[PDB]
RNA sequence: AGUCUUGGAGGUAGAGCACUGAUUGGACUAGGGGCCGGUUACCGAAUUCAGUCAAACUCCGAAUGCCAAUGACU
RNA sequence: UGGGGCGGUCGCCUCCUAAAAGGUAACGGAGGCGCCCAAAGGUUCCCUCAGAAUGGUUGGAAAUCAUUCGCAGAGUGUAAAGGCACAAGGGAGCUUGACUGCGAGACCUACAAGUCGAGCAGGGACGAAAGUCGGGCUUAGUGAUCCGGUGGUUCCGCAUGGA
RNA sequence: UGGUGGCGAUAGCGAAGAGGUCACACCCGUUCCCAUACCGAACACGGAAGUUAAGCUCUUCAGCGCCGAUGGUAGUCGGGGGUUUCCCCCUGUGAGAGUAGGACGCCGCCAA
RNA sequence: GCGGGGUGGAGCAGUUCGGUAGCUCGUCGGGCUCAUAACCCGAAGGUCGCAGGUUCAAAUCCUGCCCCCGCAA
RNA sequence: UCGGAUCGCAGUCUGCAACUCGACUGCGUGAAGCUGGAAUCGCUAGUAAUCGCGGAUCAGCAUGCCGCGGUGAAUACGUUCC
């Protein structure tokens, strides 16, 4: 599971997810990619599951770029406690994905094979996504 | 060594003129310990020295295998440390092969 | 190799520092001095308008001396500019040492300006 | 658990205290600040704690001070 | 270690000023020329014992 | 001085002809010579500085300035502001006087001397040669000396390139290693 | 007091990478370990090219709101 | 006080939350303070820092030099923020303004407090002079009243003089 | 030309040139004033042997840096709507980035 | 997550307040004995859990990191 | 100027042959060692102690072994104890 090696602050505001992706909206490195249509948090667990799905289907042929990184920490309070008495402890790591962001890129395979690999990955993710080609 | 003799950084940085008369003597002792020597001449070694320092000196000198020459009018200290005597009598120095207590 | 910084560039730094606390006004203008290898110059400039009221150097026809880059010449220059200032109704001035150490020729020019009757 | 945070100092009401174009009596505090966000211009002093105050009566004028810095001036009214 | 002190004027004795000093750095009674309001002039003030 | 007078009359015009400059001002000359005694044993021995300053005094014929560490370094147990070096700046006559003695006497007396290296230029026409023992200098008496300290001698020139500086030092009489 | 006009203080939204942190791929890499001082696609500092990201990052930077000034209309 | 209890907190400083004036809560997110300096203050004068490459006896990645590049990538007693390279950073000479009486007018503010202040007078430090100096780059380093101790005093003193 | 000011680097860096009779410099000395944590390097004090090589001044260059629209877009004020962690429409406003382009200084005073 | 421990081979001090690393037993070598034990005579064995700072000097003070033991878990 | 180890260099002799692995010589080098803890051994007179000499083995090689003489002591009260 991806996570930063250190962070400036362990506990961050959840923030807001308005507007389209600031950058990274086009396929830049690979030939094919999967593009987000909705905003959502993507946990490192979801990235790991998606990457394994797409890479296994490609039989370790061709490169996979992960264009999102789970930098944002999120917390959770202990089970069965009342409100208050301080912010929760850091639980996990998420990447904030806004509409337009290309999450994964694939290269070194046919489009037909690429489409299937990215379809399998998309079903591991909690957002709707479309297949895109580079320009 | 100074620290072991109870002179800490404070006293070390001060002019010797400020040190107590026994503190001045612990400073002179360190100048002796730092010498790589074979003989110890102790001229009145028990003046200006407190019980802990005198007791420690007594223990150490009993173990020392080199030559010790000590002048002291504390006959107890002499009688514990010295086994032979040079007596100054009638403008003559005579050597006696006996302890201070026996000679008297 | 060794690039030598220009003395003038260094001098301008010292002069700028002087000018932080010191500036010529209409009533009490700034007597600025410049000291070259060969000559010495004095201007009396009001800084609110950027106008030089009086001036005198070792290039004027009044001064007759050959070695113009020494204390004797500097004394005459300070005297001459100070006379012209009194004619133009300048009594009080601020001395701007131009980044030079207040010594030798510049000090000599200053002394001449006081005797001629500038209040500083 | 329990929080190790929860402290803060009183707000120091910094910032501009008179407007550009406004008439001020001498002594009036013009700007409170840490360091020199704004510099003292004409007829303005800088107090011990960087406060900018009018040295005379006049109109406050905030002005560009070179390329990246600002200053405030007080200009006496044209009688 | 660092203590409050009072400086008395050495002419009139008045304890005109209070200040602090670090006793290890300045163990001796400090002296300072300071304005004495009674004498209406600057005078040597010495730390009181 | 022999070397100084030699430069003004013979060497300077010769170098003008060599590189065909537009002005005599363009001829490389030697501006200053700094001799540095890295006193790294000043941390351990307190009187290490006094040894280096007494040698430079005789060697340079000019009172050195004691240089100190800019920052603390753990490896050497060095605290900022500790005197750990000596330095002396020679200009003008005293520079030539020392350089004359250095070339004529000191470098020959180096134990198994084989000429100074050709690679020891900074890249912009400044030479630095490392002296290892202070015995080569005839001012230093063997008996009084306790420790065998060396030194660095930086020749700073106005030559833009190393080639032009090398030509300058050669004619001055620098024993280059063939 | 409202509105219009004019001036000004400020660093948010957005945006951006110029600093501080986090971070992807390639290049170049000092070293580091595992092999016989010579190499492994073996951990790899740093540098650079492109590309992301930030409540407690900013080369920038609004809309509003705020403080005034001069008339005008109310 | 997301019942009470435990734990934590209680006064002050800095930042974020705070939504571009100011202000703004939660047992919201981060840290500091209860000092330090007799120079680390004042003034006069001078001055640039970190880092890298190359050259060099010990010398080694890194001690001291020397050249080139090099906006601050350093430093600024002490947190953080805001400032600072006509320096507020570094060095040197002399000094004690780390002054006395004050104070137009402002900020902040329920009050009590807190903050800034030109200028005036007295007597001074530095400076040739202008001029600067009522501590420190700025913002923490603190505690009302009552009651006691001490020093000064053209005050009072229970008939009067003292006490 | 030299000095001395004002103005956001459109004023700067970098590159290629050109100039000095006078002026500015480099440059030549340390008896004196003054000086360097050492050094006449600097700061001082004096001089004029020669050099435009550098500084400086004057040219040309858009290579770096700087300035900078219009349009579009994000955001946003006010007013609505919806499928409401958000999104869309209307009045107004309107960036940042990117770009056309600007720009290798403009305006003073004194002296020679 | 909350506390307590890491000092020669074993068990323990010394830590706050910096100043030669120690006590008991054990291990090793040599004696005594026919031989072993006891006993006698010498020595080794920890740089104080590990890695860096502060200091002239750190087991001791500071910073991180790794183990052991209690609970909750 | 005790002590002679170790080591460098150069040699002699024996032997087919002195590297592993010989004795001796010359030059140079100049170690530990300042009378030795617990403990323990020999000796009653020409003995102990000390000084040399010879011989067997043997081409060469002894600080060992077996012999020889030179100088030449101290002490034995006694049987309490091992
Ligand atoms: Mg006494
Ligand atoms: Mg944003
Ligand atoms: Mg509760
Ligand atoms: Mg605000
Ligand atoms: Zn008085």
UniProtKB/Swiss-Prot annotation, chain C:
An annotated GO cellular component: cytosolic large ribosomal subunit
Family annotation (Pfam families): Ribosomal_L18p
Bridged cysteine pairs (disulfide): none
BP-aspect Gene Ontology terms: rRNA processing; translation
Gene3D superfamilies noted in UniProt: 3.30.420.100
Entry keywords, A to Z: Chaperone, Ribonucleoprotein, Ribosomal protein, RNA-binding, rRNA processing, rRNA-binding
One term of GO molecular function: 5S rRNA binding
UniProt keyword annotation of rRNA processing present: yes
InterPro entries named among the record's database cross-references: Ribosomal_uL18_bac-type, Ribosomal_uL18_bac/euk
Keyword Secreted: no
Its job: This is one of the proteins that bind and probably mediate the attachment of the 5S RNA into the large ribosomal subunit, where it forms part of the central protuberance. Required for correct processing of both the 5' and 3' ends of 5S rRNA precursor, which is does in conjunction with ribonuclease M5 (RNase M5, rnmV). Possibly folds the 5S rRNA precursor into the correct conformation, thus acting as a chaperone.
Subunit structure: Part of the 50S ribosomal subunit. Part of the 5S rRNA/L5/L18/L25 subcomplex. Contacts the 23S rRNA and 5S rRNA. Required for catalysis of RNase M5.
HAMAP family hit by this protein: Ribosomal_uL18_B
Similarity comment: Belongs to the universal ribosomal protein uL18 family.
Protein name per Swiss-Prot or TrEMBL: Large ribosomal subunit protein uL18
From Swiss-Prot, chain D:
UniProt GO BP: translation
One annotated Gene Ontology cellular component of this protein: cytosolic large ribosomal subunit
Gene ablation phenotype (knockout): No effect on sporulation at 37 degrees Celsius, however sporulation decreases at 47 degrees Celsius.
Assembly and oligomerization: Part of the 50S ribosomal subunit.
Similarity annotation: Belongs to the bacterial ribosomal protein bL27 family.
Function comment: Plays a role in sporulation at high temperatures.
Protein name: Large ribosomal subunit protein bL27
Stretch of the intact protein here: 16 to 94 of 94
From Swiss-Prot, chain E:
GO CC terms in record: cytoplasm; ribonucleoprotein complex; ribosome
Cross-referenced PROSITE patterns: RIBOSOMAL_L33
Annotated region (Disordered), positions in chain: 20-49
Gene Ontology biological process terms from the UniProt entry: translation
Domain of life of the source: Bacteria
Alphabetic keyword roster: Ribonucleoprotein, Ribosomal protein
GO molecular function: structural constituent of ribosome
Record field: compositional bias (Basic and acidic residues): 25-49
Family: Belongs to the bacterial ribosomal protein bL33 family.
NCBIfam families per UniProt: PRK00504.1, PRK00595.1, rpmG_bact
Subunit structure: Part of the 50S ribosomal subunit. Interacts with VmlR.
Entry protein name: Large ribosomal subunit protein bL33A
Organism from which the protein derives: Bacillus subtilis (strain 168)
From Swiss-Prot, chain F:
Example GO BP: translation
Keyword RNA-binding among record annotations: yes
Matching Pfam families: Ribosomal_L5, Ribosomal_L5_C
InterPro entries: Ribosomal_uL5, Ribosomal_uL5_bac-type, Ribosomal_uL5_C, Ribosomal_uL5_CS, Ribosomal_uL5_dom_sf, Ribosomal_uL5_N
Keywords: Ribonucleoprotein, Ribosomal protein, RNA-binding, rRNA-binding, tRNA-binding
SUPFAM superfamilies: RL5-like
Gene3D superfamilies: 3.30.1440.10
Example of a GO cellular component annotation carried by this entry: cytosolic large ribosomal subunit
Top-level taxon in the UniProt lineage: Bacteria
Keyword set includes tRNA-binding: yes
Single Gene Ontology MF annotation: RNA binding
Family listed: Belongs to the universal ribosomal protein uL5 family.
Subunit structure and binding partners: Part of the 50S ribosomal subunit. Part of the 5S rRNA/L5/L18/L25 subcomplex. Contacts the 5S rRNA and the P site tRNA. Forms a bridge to the 30S subunit in the 70S ribosome. Interacts with VmlR. In stalled ribosomes contacts MutS2.
PANTHER family referenced in this protein's UniProt entry, alphabetically: 60S RIBOSOMAL PROTEIN L11-RELATED
Function: This is one of the proteins that bind and probably mediate the attachment of the 5S RNA into the large ribosomal subunit, where it forms part of the central protuberance. In the 70S ribosome it contacts protein S13 of the 30S subunit (bridge B1b), connecting the 2 subunits; this bridge is implicated in subunit movement. Contacts the P site tRNA; the 5S rRNA and some of its associated proteins might help stabilize positioning of ribosome-bound tRNAs.
This protein's name: Large ribosomal subunit protein uL5
Originating organism: Bacillus subtilis (strain 168)
Gene name for this UniProt entry: rplE
